[PDB]
Design a binder for this molecule. Structure first.
Ligand SMILES: NC(=O)c1ccc[n+]([C@@H]2O[C@H](COP(=O)([O-])OP(=O)(O)OC[C@H]3O[C@@H](n4cnc5c(N)ncnc54)[C@H](O)[C@@H]3O)[C@@H](O)[C@H]2O)c1
Ligand SMILES: Cc1cc2nc3c(=O)[nH]c(=O)nc-3n(C[C@H](O)[C@H](O)[C@H](O)COP(=O)(O)O)c2cc1C
Ligand code: SF4
Ligand code: FES
Ligand SMILES: [Cl-]
Ligand code: NA
Lengths: 155, 416
């Protein structure tokens, strides 16, 4: 497999960053996930090469870390917290609003493939519970109407 | 341009850690310098490393990652082993209810960076890392930008301020494993491996990153370092009780009118946090319980305890989740059990199976589908997650839930 040059360039950016190349795997994997909208399986053989690690090593990593997804491609990952505080403040109300607007449950992807809901543990924002992240952007859930408007920004 | 981050409320009576960070925006190096930023770094470099350790040791500063280990002593340990040595700032902060560290990172990165450079110099570490969770993207970008500023102003690089000391701070990111918060697992992650905790001892200070003395410290702990140098160890000790002196950030969440981080002295009681500072409960309800993160559970009869690291103290990371009378205890435990099910790394069998079975059996109890043996099985599993485990997740995986059964037997009985 061959990476696009711009993406190749950044991956390689990350490898030169730390003293040892192998330390840049998570950063590189993040770039790949961010670019492709998921972690392609075919992308791994190439990356191990640049990492100067075995393919197995890289695949053990991808499986281990929950932020990387190798099965489903989504433009925008709606990370919805499911931990205690958020649950007390009203994760359910949030899930409901997401179902109504996007017509999908957690773990599911819209037919568009643009929005995927991912249930996650505490996002480090418990006072602003219920919490959700649209990709790198993080917001508090207030109401269905409010949610629509935010989601509207993700096209 | 940084990603959207919620404006978590911040309030302080000490006006140290939250001096700038009480305002929910990025404070840049100019704004930091205007407030006497980097003065402490400059004072530090004129002192010898050993003197800094003495100051931090005499400061009585303890770890803010929950274990409450004395920072000064930890530093002495690293330095007895030959170099090279490494310095890691632990910014993984994935524990439920705990959002104290990010507000420093996001709002006052330079306080952290100043603390890191001083800390690095104390232990003679010429390489320094920040491991920030991957779910804090704005923190990562804010820190990267801040490092550049300090570097451009000469706070980072070779021969910093003609001191002769060379430092680079590298920013690593996690990818969703709570376990990477444990120092040895963090080190494995920094080595490009999976986050599997190493058997201790050896401790990181003896053997750590690339088998070299490594000091791992929490974001909050490092943030105190500038104040200690700036004020002096004696002045610092006068903050709060001598017993447990210095500013402590308290992340308060759940059923309160005013949820956020509160900078307070450690003689503050848990009642004052909730009622004095946090505004009391939503709807003026009776407090049923406080969950100290995923670690401890406190009943309403234990509210008059100091927010310190004493045996009778609240302890931990000071994380305060308040549950009111309406909130179902069993339902809360389910979420807590769910948390350890997801975050167990699986290296140890009691931990691996225990976390799963606790979560799975507890779900059966809550849904009303639990057989007689499921009940007896759940009780056993909860008391046998800890055996043979090599890190603290497995030890504490059953700790809170146990306390619910003990302190709230009546509500549990209903589920039978
Ligand atoms: O969360 C916390 C997790 O704590 P943990 O298990 O990661 O750490 P721990 O309680 O085992 O120790 C905390 C810190 O103290 C250091 N330390 C402890 N004993 C030491 C010794 N003899 N020599 C050198 N360094 C030593 C460790 O390296 C670590 O940085 C919980 O304790 C909370 O309540
Ligand atoms: C499962 C687990 C998760 C942890 N998570 C964190 C964390 O997010 N941040 C942190 O600073 N320490 C965390 N720790 C504690 C670290 O292992 C270590 O004790 C601490 O970072 C040392 O810094 P301190 O002495 O300044 O507190 C965790 C420990 C365990 C067992
Ligand atoms: S106690 Fe649990 S989390 Fe810790 S190393 Fe063992 S299996 Fe992994
Ligand atoms: S419990 Fe959801 S952000 Fe902490
Ligand atoms: Cl290398
Ligand atoms: Na987050």
């Amino acid at each position: 497999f061959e990476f696009p040059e711009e993406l190749k360039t950044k991956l390689q950016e990350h490898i030169n960053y730390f003293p040892k190349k192998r330390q840049a795997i998570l950063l590189c994997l993040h770039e790949i996930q961010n670019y492709y909208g998921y972690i392609p399986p075919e992308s791994l053989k190439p990356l191990a090469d640049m990492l100067e690690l075995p393919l197995n090593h890289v695949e053990g990593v991808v499986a281990f870390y929950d932020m990387f997804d190798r099965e489903d491609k989504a433009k925008y990952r709606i990370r919805v917290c499911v931990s205690i505080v958020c649950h007390l403040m009203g994760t359910n109300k949030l899930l409901k609003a997401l179902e109504n607007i996007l017509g999908i449950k957690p773990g599911e992807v819209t037919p568009d493939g643009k929005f995927k809901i991912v249930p996650v543990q505490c996002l480090g924002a418990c006072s602003e519970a219920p919490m959700f992240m649209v990709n790198d952007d993080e917001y508090k859930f207030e109401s269905e109407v409010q949610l629509n408007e935010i989601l509207s920004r993700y096209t | 341009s940084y990603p959207a981050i919620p404006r978590i409320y911040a309030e302080t009576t000490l006006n140290m850690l939250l001096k700038r960070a009480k305002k929910p925006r990025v404070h840049s190096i100019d704004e930091y310098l205007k407030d006497g930023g980097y003065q402490a770094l400059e004072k530090a470099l004129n002192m010898s490393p050993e003197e800094i350790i003495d100051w931090v040791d005499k400061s009585t500063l303890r770890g803010r990652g929950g274990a409450g280990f004395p920072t000064g002593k930890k530093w002495k340990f690293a330095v007895q082993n030959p170099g090279p040595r490494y310095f890691i700032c632990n910014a993984d902060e994935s524990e439920p209810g705990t959002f104290k560290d990010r507000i420093i990172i996001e709002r006052d990165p330079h306080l952290l960076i100043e603390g890191i450079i001083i800390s690095s110099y104390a232990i003679g570490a010429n390489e320094a890392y920040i491991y920030i969770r991957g779910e804090y993207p704005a923190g990562y970008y804010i820190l990267r930008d801040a490092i550049e500023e300090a570097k451009k102003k000469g706070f980072l690089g070779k021969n910093i301020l003609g001191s002769g000391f060379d430092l680079e701070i590298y920013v690593a990111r996690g990818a969703g494993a709570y376990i990477c918060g444990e120092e040895t697992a963090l080190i494995e992650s920094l080595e490009g491996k999976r986050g599997h905790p190493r058997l201790k001892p050896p401790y990181p200070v003896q053997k750590g990153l690339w088998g070299k003395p490594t000091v791992v410290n929490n974001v909050e702990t490092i943030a105190n370092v500038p104040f200690i140098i700036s004020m002096g160890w004696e002045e610092y000790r006068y903050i709060g009780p001598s017993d447990y002196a210095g500013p402590k950030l308290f992340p308060v969440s759940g059923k309160v009118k005013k949820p956020g981080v509160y900078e307070l002295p450690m003689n503050t009681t848990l009642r004052e946090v909730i009622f004095k500072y946090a505004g009391g409960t939503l709807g003026n309800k009776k407090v049923k319980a406080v969950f100290s993160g995923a670690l401890d559970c406190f009943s309403s009869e234990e509210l008059d305890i100091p927010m310190d690291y004493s045996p009778l103290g609240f302890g931990g990371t000071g994380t305060v989740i308040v549950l009111t009378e309406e909130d179902d205890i069993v339902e809360a435990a389910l979420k807590i059990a769910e948390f350890y099910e997801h975050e167990t790394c699986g290296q140890c069998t009691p931990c691996r199976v225990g976390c799963y079975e606790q979560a799975n059996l507890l779900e059966k109890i809550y849904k009303g589908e639990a057989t007689e043996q499921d009940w007896e099985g759940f009780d056993f599993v909860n008391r046998n997650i800890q055996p043979t485990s090599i890190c603290g997740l497995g030890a504490v995986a059953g700790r809170l839930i146990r306390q619910t059964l003990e302190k709230f037997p009546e509500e549990w009985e209903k589920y039978r």
